[PDB]
Amino acid sequence: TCNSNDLKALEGFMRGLESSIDGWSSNCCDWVGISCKSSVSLGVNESGRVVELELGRRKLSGKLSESVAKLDQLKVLNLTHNSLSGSIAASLLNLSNLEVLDLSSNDFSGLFPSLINLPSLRVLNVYENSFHGLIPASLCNNLPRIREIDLAMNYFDGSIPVGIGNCSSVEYLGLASNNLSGSIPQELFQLSNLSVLALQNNRLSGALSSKLGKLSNLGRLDISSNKFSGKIPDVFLELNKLWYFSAQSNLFNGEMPRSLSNSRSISLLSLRNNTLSGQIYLNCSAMTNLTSLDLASNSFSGSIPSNLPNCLRLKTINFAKIKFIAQIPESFKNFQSLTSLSFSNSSIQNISSALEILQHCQNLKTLVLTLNFQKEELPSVPSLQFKNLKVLIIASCQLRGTVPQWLSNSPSLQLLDLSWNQLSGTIPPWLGSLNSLFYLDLSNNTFIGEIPHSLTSLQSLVSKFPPMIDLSYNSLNGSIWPEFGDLRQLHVLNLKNNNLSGNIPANLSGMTSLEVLDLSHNNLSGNIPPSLVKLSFLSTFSVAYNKLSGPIPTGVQFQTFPNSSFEGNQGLC
């Protein structure tokens, strides 16, 4: 049997909402989202008390009534993922039985209540709201049972409070995605039970202290996207549980500390977009947990470290925007762990050698070679085989050649981007036979001849990065096959700046998911087929600069297209 004073409180709460909660019978202890425990359980009159109110993802809207603080036996309040807004009553943080507070993913704003007394609280979740001002200075002075604090994705600003050290039982502390600035207070390095520290996406600056070594339970540390500067402290011997470290996008300099090069624990390491100098060095017999390594966009000199294939767990590698001026070492022939490689804009030479070597990597799914090998010849040798390859991107390399047959040795290929090279010849009809291939970018080469009918037959675009065939800026001729209509999964078809001829097929609307359709700058005749009005998702369209004539379809999407996307045609009206 439900309690009197608790029902009054639940009423005020309902009074504050904008819509009624389904499932709320007049006995509230049987209501959905509520849990009761007897007065004598919690220890002459005995009633049900409301210990747990769980409303998550209920599509609720309104303020959060001050009266909710009148349930004193409340243990867990979970409001997550709703539309609630307004401020938080000071009293809502004075509850002495409260264990779990989850307000995350709502519209709450205002200052966050500065006095928090929740002597029983395990969990505090305000993640992703509109709160602003300071993180409460005394926040940790009253939370002796505390485990996780998540303030992330808010407007908190100023420095991280010096009082942060009084939080010594805490394990998870997310401060990420706020307006926080300044140096990290030393007190922070006194929380010794802390296994996750997320400071990412703030204005924080200054040094990263040696004192970081004091947090010896740290498994995951994200300081990325800040103003942090100077050298990365050589502390990694002591942080022996740490598997995830991202310092990406800061002002760090100097070279990587030897202990980081020696970490037994580190798994995902991301240093990208700092300015770090010297030669990349990893002791690959030490770092046996290393899986992802991102050094991209940094000041390194020297060569590509050839000892790297000795890393037995190392799967993905991003070396982009590091200027080596080097070939790929032959030792890469031995890399069995490697699944993903990006050398993009790294000054790599000898694509002939690069591909001879990289093909012996059995497990490589994805290879990004963009902005290297300037004006070199794309290898034509049929015997190169990348069996497990899924993504191949080699773009803006000014590569000379035809589309090579050795690609056919990549049967499982999903994504192929050859755009912005000097490639020529006809588009090979065998491209149509790649069954997994949903993204093809051949644009801005010199290709000639006709679009192969087999493209019309590609398995992945028929039935079950946006799916795209982009042939634009070539010398292509012939007409647009009406069987393009069989591609029901195609989002983008970009044919612009070719010389294509005849009529827009009309069967073109079987393409149910077509979003972008660009035919501009060709030589096309006839009318825009009225059936094209059937493409429900087509946001952007151009036939501009052709020989087309007739009425423009009445449409609605058609009604949206700018004047610009019909211009250049004889008869359009």
Ligand X SMILES: *[C@@H]1O[C@H](CO)[C@@H](O)[C@H](O)[C@H]1NC(C)=O
Q: Which of 15, 59, 145, 241 touches ligand X by CB under 6 A?
A: 241
Would you count residue 250 as binding ligand X (CB under 6 A)?
yes
Looking at the Cβ atoms of 250 and 546, the one nearer to ligand X is 250
| Min dist. Cβ of residue 45 to ligand X (A) | 32
Looking at the Cβ atoms of 70 and 315, the one nearer to ligand X is 315
Residues of span 136-195 touching ligand X by CB under 6 A: none
Q: Is 439 within 8 Å of 460 (Cβ atoms)?
A: no
Q: Give the DSSP per-residue string, 268-328.
A: EEE--SS---SB----TTT--S--EEE--S---BS---TTGGG-SS--EEE-TT----BPP
Q: Which of 39, 47, 80, 454 touches ligand X by CB under 6 A?
A: 80
**Residue with tokens 């010389």, as numbered in its chain:** 499
Would you count residue 21 as binding ligand X (CB under 6 A)?
no
The count of other CB atoms within 10 Å of the CB of residue 418 is 24
Pairwise CA distance, residues 468 & 492, whole Å: 5
| Min dist. Cβ of residue 248 to ligand X (A) | 8
30 contacts: CB under 8 Å, gap ≥ 6: none
Phi, then psi, of 157 in degrees rounded to 5:
-140, -175
Token pair, residue 323, equals 């200027």
Torsion, Cα of 559, 563, 564, 566 (10° steps) = 70
Q: Which of 321, 365, 496, 521 touches ligand X by CB under 6 A?
A: 321
Between CA 2 and CA 198, with CA 75 as vertex, the angle to 5 degrees is 150
Q: Which of 473, 541, 545, 566 touches ligand X by CB under 6 A?
A: 473
Residues of span 351-390 touching ligand X by CB under 6 A: 352-353, 371
Q: Strand locations in 370-524, DSSP E? A: 391-393, 415-417, 439-441, 468-470, 492-494, 516-518
Looking at the Cβ atoms of 108 and 473, the one nearer to ligand X is 473
Phi, then psi, of 430 in degrees rounded to 5:
-70, -15
Looking at the Cβ atoms of 491 and 521, the one nearer to ligand X is 521
Would you count residue 57 as binding ligand X (CB under 6 A)?
yes
| Min dist. Cβ of residue 273 to ligand X (A) | 4
| Min dist. Cβ of residue 380 to ligand X (A) | 15
Task: For residue 48, give the H/E element and its range.
Answer: strand 48-54
| Min dist. Cβ of residue 170 to ligand X (A) | 15
| Min dist. Cβ of residue 83 to ligand X (A) | 15
43 contacts: CB under 8 Å, gap ≥ 6: none
The count of other CB atoms within 10 Å of the CB of residue 108 is 22
Would you count residue 283 as binding ligand X (CB under 6 A)?
yes
- Terminal Cα-to-Cα distance of the chain (whole angstroms): 74
Q: Which of 105, 224, 249, 498 touches ligand X by CB under 6 A?
A: 249
Looking at the Cβ atoms of 210 and 283, the one nearer to ligand X is 283
Q: Which stretch binds ligand X (CB under 6 A): 176-184, 260-268, 299-307, 379-387?
A: 260-268
Sign of CA dihedral 397, 398, 403, 404: negative
Query: Which pairing describes strands 172-174 and 148-150: parallel, antiparallel, or unpaired?
Result: parallel
Q: Which of 190, 316, 350, 513 touches ligand X by CB under 6 A?
A: 350
Pairwise CA distance, residues 519 & 30, whole Å: 62
Three-class DSSP category at 6: helix
Q: Which of 100, 167, 239, 348 touches ligand X by CB under 6 A?
A: 100
Looking at the Cβ atoms of 94 and 350, the one nearer to ligand X is 350
In b/e form, how buried is each residue of 505-541, taking b as 16+ CB within 10 angstroms?
A: bbbbbbbebbbbbbbbbbebebbbbbbbbebeebeeb
Residues of span 414-443 touching ligand X by CB under 6 A: 420
Looking at the Cβ atoms of 296 and 535, the one nearer to ligand X is 296
Looking at the Cβ atoms of 247 and 451, the one nearer to ligand X is 247
**Residue with tokens 């070939």, as numbered in its chain:** 327
Pairwise CA distance, residues 413 & 431, whole Å: 10
Would you count residue 243 as binding ligand X (CB under 6 A)?
yes
Pairwise CA distance, residues 491 & 469, whole Å: 9
List the x/- string, 106-125, binding to ligand X by CB under 6 A.
-----------------x-x
Which of 500, 495, 449, 503 lies closest to 469, judged by CA?
495
Looking at the Cβ atoms of 267 and 359, the one nearer to ligand X is 267
List the x/- string, 527-556, binding to ligand X by CB under 6 A.
------------------------------
Looking at the Cβ atoms of 243 and 245, the one nearer to ligand X is 243
Q: Which of 73, 200, 202, 267 touches ligand X by CB under 6 A?
A: 267
Q: Which of 82, 177, 339, 345 touches ligand X by CB under 6 A?
A: 345
| Min dist. Cβ of residue 344 to ligand X (A) | 6
Q: What are the helix and strand counts (H, E) for the chain?
A: 5, 28
Q: Is 82 within 8 Å of 125 (Cβ atoms)?
A: no
Query: Which pairing describes strands 48-54 and 34-38: parallel, antiparallel, or unpaired?
Result: antiparallel
| Min dist. Cβ of residue 128 to ligand X (A) | 13
Pairwise CA distance, residues 74 & 378, whole Å: 69
Token pair, residue 542, equals 């151009």
Using Cβ positions, the residue closest to ligand X within the complex turns out to be 56
Looking at the Cβ atoms of 57 and 453, the one nearer to ligand X is 57
**Residue with tokens 């002791």, as numbered in its chain:** 283
Looking at the Cβ atoms of 100 and 295, the one nearer to ligand X is 100
| Min dist. Cβ of residue 353 to ligand X (A) | 3
Q: Which of 102, 294, 441, 470 touches ligand X by CB under 6 A?
A: 102
Binding stretches for ligand X (CB under 6 A): 56-57, 78, 80, 100, 102, 123, 125, 241, 243, 249-250, 262, 264-265, 267, 273, 283, 285-286, 289, 291, 321, 327, 344-345, 350, 352-353, 371, 396, 398, 420, 444, 473
